[PDB]
Design a protein around this ligand. Sequence first.
Ligand SMILES: *[C@@H]1O[C@H](CO[C@@H]2O[C@@H](C)[C@@H](O)[C@@H](O)[C@@H]2O)[C@@H](O[C@@H]2O[C@H](CO)[C@@H](O[C@@H]3O[C@H](CO[C@H]4O[C@H](CO)[C@@H](O)[C@H](O)[C@@H]4O)[C@@H](O)[C@H](O[C@H]4O[C@H](CO)[C@@H](O)[C@H](O)[C@@H]4O)[C@@H]3O)[C@H](O)[C@H]2NC(C)=O)[C@H](O)[C@H]1NC(C)=O
Ligand SMILES: *[C@@H]1O[C@H](CO[C@@H]2O[C@@H](C)[C@@H](O)[C@@H](O)[C@@H]2O)[C@@H](O[C@@H]2O[C@H](CO)[C@@H](O)[C@H](O)[C@H]2NC(C)=O)[C@H](O)[C@H]1NC(C)=O
Ligand SMILES: *[C@@H]1O[C@H](CO)[C@@H](O[C@@H]2O[C@H](CO)[C@@H](O)[C@H](O)[C@H]2NC(C)=O)[C@H](O)[C@H]1NC(C)=O
Ligand SMILES: *[C@@H]1O[C@H](CO)[C@@H](O)[C@H](O)[C@H]1NC(C)=O
Ligand SMILES: *[C@@H]1O[C@H](CO)[C@@H](O)[C@H](O)[C@H]1NC(C)=O
Ligand SMILES: *[C@@H]1O[C@H](CO)[C@@H](O)[C@H](O)[C@H]1NC(C)=O
Ligand SMILES: *[C@H]1O[C@H](CO)[C@@H](O)[C@H](O)[C@@H]1O
Ligand SMILES: *[C@H]1O[C@H](CO)[C@@H](O)[C@H](O)[C@@H]1O
Ligand SMILES: *[C@H]1O[C@H](CO)[C@@H](O)[C@H](O)[C@@H]1O
Ligand SMILES: *[C@H]1O[C@H](CO)[C@@H](O)[C@H](O)[C@@H]1O
Ligand SMILES: [Ca+2]
Ligand SMILES: [Ca+2]
Ligand SMILES: [Ca+2]
Ligand SMILES: [Ca+2]
Ligand SMILES: [Ca+2]
Ligand SMILES: [Ca+2]
Ligand SMILES: [Ca+2]
Ligand SMILES: [Ca+2]
Ligand SMILES: [Ca+2]
Ligand SMILES: [Ca+2]
Ligand SMILES: [Ca+2]
Ligand SMILES: [Ca+2]
Ligand SMILES: [Ca+2]
Ligand SMILES: [Ca+2]
Ligand SMILES: [Ca+2]
Ligand SMILES: [Ca+2]
Ligand SMILES: [Ca+2]
Ligand SMILES: [Ca+2]
Ligand SMILES: [Ca+2]
Ligand SMILES: [Ca+2]
Ligand SMILES: [Ca+2]
Ligand SMILES: [Ca+2]
Ligand SMILES: [Ca+2]
Ligand SMILES: [Ca+2]
Ligand SMILES: [Ca+2]
Ligand SMILES: [Ca+2]
Ligand SMILES: [Ca+2]
Ligand SMILES: [Ca+2]
Ligand SMILES: [Ca+2]
Ligand SMILES: [Ca+2]
Lengths: 625, 633
Amino acid sequence: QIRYKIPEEMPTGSVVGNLAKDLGFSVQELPTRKLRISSEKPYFSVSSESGELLVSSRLDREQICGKKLMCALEFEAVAENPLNFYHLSVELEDINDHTPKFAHTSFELQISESSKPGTRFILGSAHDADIGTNSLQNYQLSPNDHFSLVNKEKSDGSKYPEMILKTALDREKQKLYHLTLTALDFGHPPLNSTAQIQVLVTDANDNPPVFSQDIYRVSLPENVYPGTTVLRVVATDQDEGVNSEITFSFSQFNLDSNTGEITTLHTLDFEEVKEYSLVLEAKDGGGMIAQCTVEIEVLDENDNVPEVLFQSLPDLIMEDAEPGTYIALLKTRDKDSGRNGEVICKLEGGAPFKILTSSGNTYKLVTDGVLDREQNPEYNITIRATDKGDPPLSSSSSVTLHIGDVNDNAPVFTKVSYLVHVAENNPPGASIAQVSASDPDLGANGQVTYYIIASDLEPESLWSYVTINAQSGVLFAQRAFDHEQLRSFQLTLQARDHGSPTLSANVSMRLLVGDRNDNAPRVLYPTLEPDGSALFDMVPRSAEPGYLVTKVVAVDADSGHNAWLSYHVLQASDPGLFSLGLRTGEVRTARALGDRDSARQRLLVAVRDGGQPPLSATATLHLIF
Amino acid sequence: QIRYKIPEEMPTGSVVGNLAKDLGFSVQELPTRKLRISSEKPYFSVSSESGELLVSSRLDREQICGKKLMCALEFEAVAENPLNFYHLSVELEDINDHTPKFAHTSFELQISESSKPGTRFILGSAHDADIGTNSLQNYQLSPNDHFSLVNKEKSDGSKYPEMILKTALDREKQKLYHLTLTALDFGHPPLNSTAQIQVLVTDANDNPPVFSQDIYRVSLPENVYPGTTVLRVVATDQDEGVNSEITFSFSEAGQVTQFNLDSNTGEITTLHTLDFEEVKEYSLVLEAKDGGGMIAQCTVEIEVLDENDNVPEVLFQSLPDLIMEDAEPGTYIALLKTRDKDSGRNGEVICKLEGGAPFKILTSSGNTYKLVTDGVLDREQNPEYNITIRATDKGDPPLSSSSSVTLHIGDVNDNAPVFTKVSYLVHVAENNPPGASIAQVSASDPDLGANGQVTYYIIASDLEPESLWSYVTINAQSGVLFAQRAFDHEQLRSFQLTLQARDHGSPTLSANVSMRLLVGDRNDNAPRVLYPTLEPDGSALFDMVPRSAEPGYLVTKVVAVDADSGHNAWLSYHVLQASDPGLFSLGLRTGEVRTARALGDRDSARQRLLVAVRDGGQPPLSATATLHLIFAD
Ligand SMILES: *[C@@H]1O[C@H](CO[C@@H]2O[C@@H](C)[C@@H](O)[C@@H](O)[C@@H]2O)[C@@H](O[C@@H]2O[C@H](CO)[C@@H](O[C@@H]3O[C@H](CO[C@H]4O[C@H](CO)[C@@H](O)[C@H](O)[C@@H]4O)[C@@H](O)[C@H](O[C@H]4O[C@H](CO)[C@@H](O)[C@H](O)[C@@H]4O)[C@@H]3O)[C@H](O)[C@H]2NC(C)=O)[C@H](O)[C@H]1NC(C)=O
Ligand SMILES: *[C@@H]1O[C@H](CO[C@@H]2O[C@@H](C)[C@@H](O)[C@@H](O)[C@@H]2O)[C@@H](O[C@@H]2O[C@H](CO)[C@@H](O)[C@H](O)[C@H]2NC(C)=O)[C@H](O)[C@H]1NC(C)=O
Ligand SMILES: *[C@@H]1O[C@H](CO)[C@@H](O[C@@H]2O[C@H](CO)[C@@H](O)[C@H](O)[C@H]2NC(C)=O)[C@H](O)[C@H]1NC(C)=O
Ligand SMILES: *[C@@H]1O[C@H](CO)[C@@H](O)[C@H](O)[C@H]1NC(C)=O
Ligand SMILES: *[C@@H]1O[C@H](CO)[C@@H](O)[C@H](O)[C@H]1NC(C)=O
Ligand SMILES: *[C@@H]1O[C@H](CO)[C@@H](O)[C@H](O)[C@H]1NC(C)=O
Ligand SMILES: *[C@H]1O[C@H](CO)[C@@H](O)[C@H](O)[C@@H]1O
Ligand SMILES: *[C@H]1O[C@H](CO)[C@@H](O)[C@H](O)[C@@H]1O
Ligand SMILES: *[C@H]1O[C@H](CO)[C@@H](O)[C@H](O)[C@@H]1O
Ligand SMILES: *[C@H]1O[C@H](CO)[C@@H](O)[C@H](O)[C@@H]1O
Ligand SMILES: [Ca+2]
Ligand SMILES: [Ca+2]
Ligand SMILES: [Ca+2]
Ligand SMILES: [Ca+2]
Ligand SMILES: [Ca+2]
Ligand SMILES: [Ca+2]
Ligand SMILES: [Ca+2]
Ligand SMILES: [Ca+2]
Ligand SMILES: [Ca+2]
Ligand SMILES: [Ca+2]
Ligand SMILES: [Ca+2]
Ligand SMILES: [Ca+2]
Ligand SMILES: [Ca+2]
Ligand SMILES: [Ca+2]
Ligand SMILES: [Ca+2]
Ligand SMILES: [Ca+2]
Ligand SMILES: [Ca+2]
Ligand SMILES: [Ca+2]
Ligand SMILES: [Ca+2]
Ligand SMILES: [Ca+2]
Ligand SMILES: [Ca+2]
Ligand SMILES: [Ca+2]
Ligand SMILES: [Ca+2]
Ligand SMILES: [Ca+2]
Ligand SMILES: [Ca+2]
Ligand SMILES: [Ca+2]
Ligand SMILES: [Ca+2]
Ligand SMILES: [Ca+2]
Ligand SMILES: [Ca+2]
Ligand SMILES: [Ca+2]
């Protein structure tokens, strides 16, 4: 056989070769035989006039042989007279008419952020229809620092390009990358194909949420109502998507997980917990955690009242207390602190007492002046302690001070001097008077007693005359008094209390003896014989009337009307002859003496007193001329 | 003429019959004469060689005679030499080549549900082109229970089938029926035609809307805000389409408006606030109707419940403005009632007294209470009381009511006036001016009014009861004591009085007090000398005194008295002046004038002395006296 070589896609009417020269047929021997090309598809034709082969239909190697290495089409040539056939095999060369081309103009790839460097990712190979050197040969990527190109070629021609990661990705630096890949064949000339690849770095949870500061500081009062916004902390996560979600947690208050704010749930208190320390943990979906701390310094409010403590209680104190003695001991204490715990105390009232501070929160009560029980025996004193909060809280305490009795008052009698008259011949041991003294003191100091100390009488008979009841003050006569023996007497008495020492008071009392008509009248002159007769026989007969015969003198031991002596005439031998002085007692002659009258004259008189009833003393007078 | 009989639809070139044998023409006489069939349309032909009749054009009886009773086709036959014509009439038989068939493959009928039984409905008759026995003869319908078929032929010859209703229809049982109708001819063989008929029962308004129950029961509080969904009622209509639309309405009831019903949804919700005290129960009648005026009604009973929204009330009916202090224990003071608008435990009211006042509540019957004294009362201690009464119900939460009463206690004369001191002691100086205040007594009476108005009187005295006015008097209103005379200590030293304080009540209460009044002594009386008596000059003579008298000789003794008492009457005797000092001795206490020393001859016989009687009063009062004493021999 014979072989010819032409390129594919050859235009029609092109000379493949003269068969007349290769088969040995003359230019005139040729038209005799009707040259006809025999083939399944009429790709060729023989113009009988020219005597050579010519291209007829379009010669598409990719549609006939395709990937076949050598395309050898065997057709026939028929010539008539004589009937003869010749088989001709033609081989066509591949033309680089099909440039390489990728399946998609653009396709995006999503690569994770935590992709390890050196990982190989497969890429779709472009489809180049030509075979041999005109086939796809070189894949080349844009020069950068993050990705690289690798060709993997086996002998079978199923070679493909893949992308090797050069450095680790980081979506926070550049979220996306756009590169151009070029496929190139080795033909004349070489023609290339471009394809864009866009890599979007998928987020990974490599950055944890971070707080603004390590330590925060907040101060709030202890009286905040439940629900006060204490503090809110905010964290920042460098990721995006779910890996950026931040949740807060604790690891009397309350924290919301999403908003991240901490608010109180119950009332605070300074006396139990002064400051709180809280630890907050922020976590994302992938367990990346970070913790911070917040210190809440609760402020001390003046909500507790200061207290006044009494330590020594003096129920009884002396009235003669010197100024400035330590009476009671007080302290002031407050649970709060600072100006809320500092307490200043004062006393309210006009009582003479002062507060003296010896040291911090230590005070003493002293007397400011001299005291007295009789004027003010009791005091209700009020003491006020106030702190230095704004506004302050105060505390009052009331003490009842009682004043004791000191023996500073002597018993006093109801009257300055006493005077008592007592009738004569009184029964002994009888009540004559009663004295009463008052002592304002209390207890034994107010127990009065009366005694006798001195008297103008003889000190030995002082007991025999009078005595005193020391408890009641009644005076008792120890003998029947005699107005004739003693007329009056002075006494001095003493009132004394039962204290230490005893205070005394002296009183003066005069006792008088009233005269009673207990003595009969006694005749002094003239003297009488046992019969009671006196004889005066020297009376002149020639005496003129009015002659002083004699005079009777009488006395009475009593005094006053009880001694008032009046002289009467009981009986007489001659009435009208004698005249008597009712007051003086002078017996005289009333008329002249007649001789008829008898020589012997008898008279009987009686001396009487003005008492009721009167006592009489009789006497007889014999008078002879 | 001559007649032949053949069937129609005969194929061409078929022998109908030999005309040579019926017309008498020889087989050689025939080609001489030009046998030709003469007709308007060449349905036949004569083959001269055959000498017989032959079919030429198509012989369609339906296009020639059609429905004509007898089909007689009359043509002629012309023969030439000699010219002669023969009339030929042929009669063709109808072929059963057209089977009966209805006009439409499917036709639907819409029949009402309330169609009376026995009604005839028209159906399209099939058209069979053949005539006679080959024509349509039998109409037959599928055997069922609701419809029947009947064939009707009118005088005009227009035969038709019709459907007779067997039973009344019901679209809720079977909404449609599909049957098969067969048309049959009476030929050999019979060929059939099928036609399907679908009857859709048209809806009628025979089913009313029906409720679930005749009577419903709902209970709601009396304090529901306007707009509370009271209840939801639903009705069911067995029809479909517009005849199934259900509308609700209020019908035949009290038109008073407190509820509200939506027509379509049928829910009832309140429109105003409820109340139990005015209307205890409500009755509602609901009407549900469709488009055709078919109605059905139901009833709902709303039993409103009594809520504890009314406060219990404490009614005071009797007011004890004045009550006696000596009220016996357990006396009826005040009359109270308790009332509550609510019911049940919401209307049950319990009343109590809070405080420390001595009063108790005693229940005589339901909601009937009385106030009684628990202890003894006193006006002086507590004259007025403010009592508080609390009434609480048994609802949750309960409602309470407090009421304050001001009771005043009257004064009863049960206290006698009391003096400030048990006994009184007052000293009054002698020679006091008459009508002057000497003392004042005060009595206290705890009673009020006239019972607490004290008055003082004099009742008893140790003095003469008739001159008591001349002695002392009392101001009965103030209690001051007034002396009606200048007192004399010498006449009387003291006197007793018994007085009584009495109020002006009924009866009067008295109290007696004893007072001793003492007259203070003043030194207003001078001492007077009794013995010896003195002449106008104040001289006394005691002569005839012996010169040889021993010392201690009692010259005389002076007696003197003083009307006063005490120091004002204590008489001491002094020596004012003397002609010879030391010659005479006087008793300072006794008053005895004696000789102190012996009488010398140098001394004169007559001795004069001047003494004074003094008292211990302040200042002392003195009485002077002169004594002349003469000696003899
Ligand atoms: C990949 O294919 C690229 C396209 O090339 C064409 O299409 C392929 C399929 C083949 O058919 C090929 O034969 C075709 O040429 C190709 O890119 C080309 O690269 C050349 C050289 O680098 C570029 O030539 C230079 O052009 C610039 C300015 O060009 C302007 O116009 C062109 C239109 O053609 C535009 O595309 C450009 O963007 C510009 O706007 C000139 O300044 C430069 O001058 C220099 O070179 C000349 C030589 O001719 C010297 O005389 C001068 O002194 C200068 O030194 C070039 O002329 C060409 O523009 C560019 N085309 C495109 C479309 O990008 C690339 O080479 C192929 N790669 C491989 C490996 O084959
Ligand atoms: C109360 O009387 C006593 C005794 O009085 C007597 O007369 C006085 C005027 C004076 O001279 C005293 O000496 C007489 O004894 C007085 O007190 C007593 O005095 C004595 C002597 O110094 C002494 O030993 C006693 O202890 C004293 N007794 C008392 C109780 O003090 C006293 O001065 C008179 N006055 C008063 C107010 O008590
Ligand atoms: C208080 O004194 C009055 C007045 O004397 C008394 O009333 C009378 O007392 C006397 C006895 O001395 C009776 O004879 C009378 O009958 C009493 N009068 C009456 C009762 O109206 C009275 O009894 C004394 N006591 C009191 C507590 O009033
Ligand atoms: C002082 O306290 C006492 C204690 O019982 C009281 O009785 C008295 O009345 C008080 N002082 C005054 C002035 O009320
Ligand atoms: C109609 O006629 C055919 C022919 O014999 C028969 O098979 C068929 O059953 C008939 N149908 C009815 C409904 O008569
Ligand atoms: C009673 O109430 C009146 C007026 O409110 C008041 O003046 C009086 O003091 C009260 N009495 C008592 C015992 O509460
Ligand atoms: C004793 O009795 C007399 C009565 O004679 C009172 O005067 C004295 O006070 C004491 O009681
Ligand atoms: C004096 O008076 C007294 C009074 O008793 C008489 O008894 C006596 O006899 C004389 O007459
Ligand atoms: C009248 O005056 C006297 C004083 O002289 C008082 O003692 C009495 O109480 C009344 O007031
Ligand atoms: C008594 O004493 C009084 C004075 O108290 C004198 O005035 C009078 O003359 C007599 O001597
Ligand atoms: Ca090609
Ligand atoms: Ca090619
Ligand atoms: Ca290529
Ligand atoms: Ca990163
Ligand atoms: Ca994260
Ligand atoms: Ca990230
Ligand atoms: Ca606190
Ligand atoms: Ca605090
Ligand atoms: Ca404090
Ligand atoms: Ca004192
Ligand atoms: Ca004292
Ligand atoms: Ca004392
Ligand atoms: Ca005597
Ligand atoms: Ca006498
Ligand atoms: Ca005497
Ligand atoms: Ca026909
Ligand atoms: Ca038929
Ligand atoms: Ca027919
Ligand atoms: Ca029905
Ligand atoms: Ca219906
Ligand atoms: Ca209906
Ligand atoms: Ca209500
Ligand atoms: Ca109620
Ligand atoms: Ca109610
Ligand atoms: Ca009373
Ligand atoms: Ca009373
Ligand atoms: Ca009274
Ligand atoms: Ca007088
Ligand atoms: Ca007097
Ligand atoms: Ca006098």
